[PDB]
Design an enzyme around this catalytic site. Structure first.
Site, PDB file in Angstrom:
ATOM      1  N   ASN A  25      73.320  62.420  46.445  1.00 51.55           N
ATOM      2  CA  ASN A  25      72.357  62.677  45.383  1.00 51.55           C
ATOM      3  C   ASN A  25      72.849  63.811  44.489  1.00 51.55           C
ATOM      4  OD1 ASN A  25      70.419  60.704  46.360  1.00 51.55           O
ATOM      5  ND2 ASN A  25      69.920  62.180  47.977  1.00 51.55           N
ATOM      6  N   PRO A  26      73.373  63.458  43.303  1.00 48.70           N
ATOM      7  CA  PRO A  26      74.026  64.401  42.398  1.00 48.70           C
ATOM      8  C   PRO A  26      73.044  65.231  41.564  1.00 48.70           C
ATOM      9  CG  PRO A  26      74.135  62.204  41.476  1.00 48.70           C
ATOM     10  CD  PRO A  26      73.360  62.089  42.755  1.00 48.70           C
ATOM     11  N   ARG A  27      72.067  65.840  42.238  1.00 54.72           N
ATOM     12  CA  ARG A  27      71.021  66.653  41.606  1.00 54.72           C
ATOM     13  C   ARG A  27      70.187  67.379  42.664  1.00 54.72           C
ATOM     14  NH1 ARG A  27      66.860  63.213  43.990  1.00 54.72           N
ATOM     15  NH2 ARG A  27      67.656  61.073  43.772  1.00 54.72           N
ATOM     16  N   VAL A  28      69.118  68.054  42.236  1.00 51.89           N
ATOM     17  CA  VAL A  28      68.139  68.608  43.178  1.00 51.89           C
ATOM     18  C   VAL A  28      67.258  67.506  43.730  1.00 51.89           C
ATOM     19  CG1 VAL A  28      67.660  71.072  42.885  1.00 51.89           C
ATOM     20  CG2 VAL A  28      67.013  69.457  41.047  1.00 51.89           C
TER      21      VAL A  28
END
Lengths: 408, 96
Positions: free
Chosen positions: B4-7
């Site tokens: 998951n390339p985010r918060v």
């Protein structure tokens, strides 16, 4: 064994004890006075009673015999005195035992030693701690908790140096700038003293710091307002622990689950201040009246403990003023300071002057941001009282529209 | 499984045990600041640890009474709380 708890207090701390108690499936009982008929703490418990039919102002929460009657009738097992009322009252503590109500705090002989500024010094010198035989002092306090079974720990320290007179303003936990070796000695002094007297429950030890030297001042034989700041950095619920300690439970057991002293450390830094009605513009005289607008902050690391801070609130002059008790917590003191500022600036209170602007400047000033600061920090800072006007726009627009709508 | 390339929604649970403000750090990294400088103040990997435990629970409009179906409707009352390590990230529910 404790199943029903009564709080001999008001405001944020009562709400604090009630929440803690409820997590332990303990019933709660509030006590209130006539002018506290709509204090939030009254509605926050499982039960509430008007202490003193015709009682006056601040004597309501001091009236030993009516409280104990309310406790007797409602079948109370334990009474938590919080802080600042009957907290350090030996008589009330005695009458609690005599009537079979567990007084939440230390024993009768504990309140005796530390109740008299003269008796406390004898206890201090018997356990070999430094005393006054005095310039540029830092005010350092150590939290301790011990059970009825001989297990005692400390929850590190609290910097209490930021104070205007005899009023504490801003506390920090742990210490910024104060050396590791100093830290250890002051802690070890505090644990030497309380483990000598066989101390029970939460207590604080007040010291003084000069350079590489410390002196004993006093012992607070109860919980302090600034307790939360220590909770945030150590991860340990002090108030909940107290209730468990007066319940017999061993602190290293299933109830308290105390990490061994070795395994107790600090995570980041925490800062606390109190939001009051005190006016920096007006000699710090507590302002009174009705709040017409109340908006609060929040978010990660921000912890709010509301006293008289809510929308409808009517502010009575008869008590030590406190709207919200506000603490912040971040990996670094620099970060911990910034959260505080934003939270202070995100706030909004109208209809009464507050101490917010004064507090904003305190956190903004770099004699505080450096971590090195003495009890004379406020004394040596005249610009700390900078007159920020603070206009109230929206309210005036709400009035215009309101007036033209109704009266044309 | 995946990245998951985010918060994540559940980020706070990690922030509370580790004591790091993740969102803050994001901004600073985007600002070009050092991971271990007086800015992000991140501890060394060996010094990064957990304190206690953290839990997160989801509150949605859907229910086990109605086969998990997100309902519309006006929220007549909203009631928060508080406590040491009790975060209420207010979102869809605020008032009427």
């Amino acid at each position: 064994q404790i199943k029903k708890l009564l709080v001999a207090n008001r405001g944020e701390i009562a709400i604090r004890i009630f929440r803690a108690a409820a997590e332990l499936d303990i019933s709660t009982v509030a006590i209130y006075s006539n002018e506290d008929k709509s204090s939030l703490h009254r509605y926050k418990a499982d039960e509430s009673y008007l202490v003193g039919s015709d009682l006056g102002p601040a004597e309501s929460y001091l009236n030993i015999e009516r409280i104990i009657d309310v406790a007797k009738q409602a079948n109370v097992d334990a009474i938590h005195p919080g802080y600042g009322f009957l907290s350090e009252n030996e008589q009330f503590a005695r009458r609690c035992a005599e009537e079979g109500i567990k007084f939440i705090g230390p024993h009768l002989e504990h309140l005796d030693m530390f109740g008299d500024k003269v008796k406390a010094r004898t206890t201090a010198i018997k356990a070999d701690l430094p005393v006054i035989p005095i310039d540029n002092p830092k005010h350092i306090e150590v939290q301790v908790i011990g059970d009825e079974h001989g297990n005692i720990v400390h929850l590190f320290e609290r910097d209490c140096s930021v104070q205007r007179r005899h009023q504490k303003v801003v506390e920090v936990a742990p210490s910024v700038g104060l050396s590791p070796t100093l830290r250890q000695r002051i802690c070890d002094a505090a644990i030497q003293l309380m483990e000598n007297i066989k101390y029970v429950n939460a207590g604080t030890v007040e010291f003084l710091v000069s350079g590489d030297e410390f002196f004993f001042i006093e012992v607070n034989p109860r919980v302090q307002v600034e307790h939360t700041i220590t909770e945030m950095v150590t991860g340990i619920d002090i108030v909940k622990t107290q209730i468990l300690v007066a319940a017999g439970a061993d602190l290293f057991g299933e109830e308290i689950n105390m990490p061994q002293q070795k395994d107790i450390t600090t995570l980041g830094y925490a800062i606390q201040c109190r939001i009051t009605t005190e006016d920096p513009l007006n000699d710090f005289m507590p302002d009174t009246g009705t709040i017409i607008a109340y908006r609060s902050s929040g978010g990660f690391g921000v912890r709010l403990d509301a006293g008289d801070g809510f929308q409808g609130a009517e502010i009575s002059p008869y008590y030590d003023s406190l709207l919200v008790k506000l603490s912040t917590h971040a990996i670094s003191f620099k970060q911990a300071e910034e959260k505080m500022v934003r939270s202070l600036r995100e706030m909004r209170i109208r209809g009464v002057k507050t101490n917010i602007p004064f507090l904003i400047n305190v956190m903004k000033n770099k004699k505080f941001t450096s971590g090195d600061y003495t009890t004379k920090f406020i004394e040596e800072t005249p610009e700390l009282f900078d007159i920020q006007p603070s206009l109230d726009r929206g309210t005036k627009t709400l009035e215009y529209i309101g007036n033209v709508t109704i009266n044309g």
